């Protein structure tokens with residue numbers, strides 16, 4: 001059993017269980033804009049409506065679920081405001097009425113003032129029927145950007161992979177208990193169970209093709225998820241009016257912000273953050289874009305003794321095989337993600353009258369994973 005301080009759910013893992021859909025009535029002016037982004041963006045009315053907002057206090061967001069919903073609401077509004085219709089006409093200043101409360105709320109939750117994975121995947125969902133299972137057909141997102149953006153497909157399939165991975169996350173304490181207690185058979189079983197759940201998560205990943213089309217993803221959704229760190233469109237970053245006087249750079253939404261994208265590498269001692277390269281740098285930097293509880297969880301996993309070293313030390317083929325089953329499953333996940341980036345970013349980019357940096361990142365992550373096979 002994982003400690004409650006890490007905000008990991010037995011059923012949905014790093015996802016926020018049963019996210020709030022509605023804020024207090026005090027925040028109706030925020031909520032109307034967020035719920036009407038498709039129409040407000042298209043009609044050129046989004047920015048004016050944000051500019052007409054009064055500065056609202058974050059004091060009436062009293063609980064974590066309300067604070068996370070507000071982050072999702074404000075984050076989606078902020079991306080809509082910065083990127084506009086998604087045609088390259090950009091806003092370089094976020095007005096104070098929205099920028100102040102967003103930054104204040106962000107500071108409170110220990111997250112940067114930009115839409116992150118934890119917002120648009122982990123807290124951006126509901127069950128259609130709460131008495132039916134966590135499946136795509138019984139689920140919907142809370143917020144989208146544009147009609148036809150495939151935000152439902154992209155966010156929900158991401159979430160469903162997170163949920164599939166929850167089954168592996170709950171075995172992590174069994175792994176560390178087994179090592180401490182010197183329980184070889186228990187450890188072997190635990191590793192095999194993790195490998196099984198990672199294999200299951202890969203099959204869930206396959207659903208992306210059914211709900212996302214390349215053109216819409218590349219030309220629309222990818223634009224709204226983009227940030228302002230090393231972005232030539234906002235080379236100095238974004239001005240958060242009334243919070244900082246000088247523009248600040250923050251990275252956009254990335255798979256690297258998923259805690260399951262990192263935690264099994266950490267568990268298995270695949271030192272993805274070692275060696276000094278770009279990939280290692282990015283993975284560490286993205287921990288600050290995760291909720292602090294999840295950042296803290298990764299820290300705790302790092303601080304425990306090494307599973308890899310344990311298995312390596314024992315002279316035990318069965319244990320090595322079970323460890324390698326986990327490593328193999330991670331390789332297959334990276335390989336699949338590469339195939340998706342090819343179909344959804346590289347090819348559309350080629351047909352545009354992008355993706356290589358993400359491809360190179362994922363190749364490095366995969367290569368490092370492959371090299372951890374014990375054999």
Ligand SMILES: C[C@H](C(=O)Nc1ccc(F)cc1)[C@]12C[C@](NC(=O)c3cccc(Cl)c3)(C1)C2
Nearest residue numbers: 117158161165201225253254255260261333337
């Ligand atoms: C494609 C999708 C994605 O990028 N979503 C995304 C990005 C940016 C956003 F702003 C919002 C959503 C994925 C990659 C994925 N998870 C793993 O690849 C993985 C890696 C190791 C272990 C496990 Cl269990 C899973 C599915 C998240």
